Amino acid sequence: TKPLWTRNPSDITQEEYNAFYKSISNDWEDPLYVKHFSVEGQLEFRAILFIPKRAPFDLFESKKKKNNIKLYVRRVFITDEAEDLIPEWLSFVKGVVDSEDLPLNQNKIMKVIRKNIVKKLIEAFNEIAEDSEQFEKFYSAFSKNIKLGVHEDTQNRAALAKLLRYNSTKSVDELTSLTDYVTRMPEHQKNIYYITGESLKAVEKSPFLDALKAKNFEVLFLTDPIDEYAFTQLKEFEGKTLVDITKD
Ligand SMILES: [Mg+2]
Known part of the structure; x- marks a missing residue:
């Protein structure tokens, strides 16, 4: 009672x-x-x-x-x-x-x-x-x-x-956290790369992935407007800077 x-x-x-x-x-x-x-x-x-x-x-x-x-x-x-x-x-x-x-x-x-x-x-x-x-x-x-x-x-x-x-080039079926992404980054990688799009399908085969996959750099896939905007408010994670590949 x-x-x-x-x-x-x-x-x-x-x-x-x-x-x-x-x-x-x-x-x-x-x-x-x-x-x-x-x-x-x-x-x-x-x-x-x-x-x-x-x-x-x-x-x-x-x-x-x-x-x-x-x-x-x-x-x-x-x-x-x-x-x-x-x-x-x-x-x-x-x-x-x-x-x-x-x-x-x-x-x-x-x-x-x-x-x-x-x-x-x-x-x-x-x-x-x-x-x-x-x-x-x-x-x-x-x-x-x-x-x-x-x-x-x-x-x-x-x-x-x-x-x-999020899903990535190295996280297809299962989702991944930004911490694990960081841990997975090679010694010479300084940025956390990602790409925005309307859908996964539309973002999976972007020609912007070639310059990264060839250098064995993982890339995140954002398909939600909120995630996109959020990333510009975050800027950096654990010290690494968030970089949109489609830009450069
Ligand atoms: Mg019960």
């Missing part, structure tokens, strides 16, 4: 998290991942956040951001329609946030909660990334929210960019 989130992650089992998830998500499936944590220091609060196995329908209105994360303050419900609690590109997250001090009434306290949540969720994505198979599932569902985050989040960009995934 004690709020699940107030319990230590160690004492909670799956199915307990699953049932609790069903209880708040209007979803029948178990969550893809569960991020239960607590924050201490200047501000104190607990939270259980979930990443759905699949992107919800959300085809009722024009907008979308209707984050139904239940907001509690010392175990007493307050609202499931909080504002600025979590970024718009992350609205797909479901769960509960229980704060010790009143989120008040913009408010400052709310901002530090939002900051910790973003930090924890990136932490959850890198975790899902440990299983390239379960990560594909997550990418198929929220690759759009990730790209959106890389575009909206300048302070967490580099980190989020580590979540992008």
Whole structure:
């Protein structure tokens, strides 16, 4: 009879998290991942956040951001329609946030909660990334929210960019991360090369690939306008510069 989130992650089992998830998500499936944590220091609060196995329908209105994360303050419900609690590109997250001090009434306290949540969720994505198979599932569902985050989040960009995934000349069937791309780059390669296009088919046989394939340089394939734009906002990854081959 004690709020699940107030319990230590160690004492909670799956199915307990699953049932609790069903209880708040209007979803029948178990969550893809569960991020239960607590924050201490200047501000104190607990939270259980979930990443759905699949992107919800959300085809009722024009907008979308209707984050139904239940907001509690010392175990007493307050609202499931909080504002600025979590970024718009992350609205797909479901769960509960229980704060010790009143989120008040913009408010400052709310901002530090939002900051910790973003930090924890990136932490959850890198975790899902440990299983390239379960990560594909997550990418198929929220690759759009990730790209959106890389575009909206300048302070967490580099980190989020580590979540992008693309096909390449050396990554045909399976997708690859920009980190693995870097690792694969030969000693004399200084740039991360890529090419933009309407589709994979249209980009796979570009004559611009010849000057690279012959020098055994891997090249990424971007087919989404958001990925393209994102790359100009990223510029560099891990130190390497992003270069569009079609240009030069
Ligand atoms: Mg089950």
